[PDB]
Design a protein around this nucleic acid. Structure first.
Ligand SMILES: [Zn+2]
Ligand SMILES: [Zn+2]
Lengths: 56, 111, 52
DNA sequence: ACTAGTAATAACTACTTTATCTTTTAAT
DNA sequence: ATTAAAAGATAAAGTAGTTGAGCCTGGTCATTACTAGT
């Protein structure tokens, strides 16, 4: 529903990996993982350029 | 809200008249003037709470996305009502809830 | 197909105006060039560059 | 009287630059 | 004594560089109207 601020409505996975994940928790976990992958990908190039500049 | 003209349909402007020292609404497109009885002309507030009521319409009662509660209505004491928050997108908007009944379809806060 | 048809219409317009200014009669069959449409579609699909 | 060669048809951060400004000074 | 001239401070805007290492695979590399051989 609209204006829901409960934890389960905003990305709280109360179940464990052994118990499984509900579809909403699965989608939220996928969103978090995608954000982490994007952050790592954008971080590697900047780190490499900084390292090359320092070496030079 | 500034009054508009009558023959060219243009909004009027405050002006001072000296022989009677009166404020009057005047038009520059034509020669139409009228008396102004309100010194209140300019308003600019830094912080406001106007607009929290939102655009509530009589058709808001059948919206399925709005959550439903059982709060006490002031006048009809209905057990069926919906609630939401303020429409204002201000950064410092409070989280006070707005309740709308279904039998009378009018708003009431917690105050 | 819209772009290729525009190009074909331009080419056939050039051909008919050349035929008129040379004072000759066209057979209406040698003016049309299917090769431009065929080659454009084939090249666009084969290479992936969506253009001429 | 026809044919084939054939040649021409991207944001982020930085520096630099320019014109604007204006205050300054000696001149009205 | 006071203000025209103007040299110069500098505020504002236009311009320009540059982006992590390697490795593998496959695909492409124009086009057609003018003028000379038989
Ligand atoms: Zn008027
Ligand atoms: Zn009610």
């Amino acid at each position: 529903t609209k204006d829901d601020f409960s934890p389960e409505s905003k990305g709280f996975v109360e179940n464990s990996y052994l118990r499984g994940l509900t579809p909403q928790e699965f989608f939220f976990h996928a969103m978090a993982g995608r954000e982490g992958l994007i952050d790592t990908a954008v971080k590697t190039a900047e780190t490499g350029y900084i390292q090359r500049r320092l070496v030079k | 809200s500034f009054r508009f003209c009558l023959e060219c349909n243009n909004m009027l402007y405050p002006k001072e008249d000296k022989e009677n020292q009166r404020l009057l609404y005047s038009c520059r497109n034509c020669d139409y003037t009228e008396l102004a009885e309100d010194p209140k002309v300019y308003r600019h507030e830094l912080i406001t709470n106007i607009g929290e009521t939102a655009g509530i319409v009589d058709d808001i009662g059948q919206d399925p996305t709005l959550p439903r509660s059982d709060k006490e209505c002031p006048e009809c004491h209905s057990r069926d009502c919906v609630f939401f928050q303020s429409q204002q997108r201000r950064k410092d908007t409070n989280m006070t809830l707005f309740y709308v009944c279904l039998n009378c379809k009018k708003t009431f806060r917690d105050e | 197909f819209r772009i290729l048809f525009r190009k074909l219409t331009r080419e056939i317009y050039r051909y008919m105006q050349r035929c008129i200014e040379t004072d000759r009669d066209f057979n209406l069959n040698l003016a049309v060039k299917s090769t431009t449409i065929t080659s454009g579609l084939k090249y666009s699909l084969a290479t992936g560059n969506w253009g001429e």
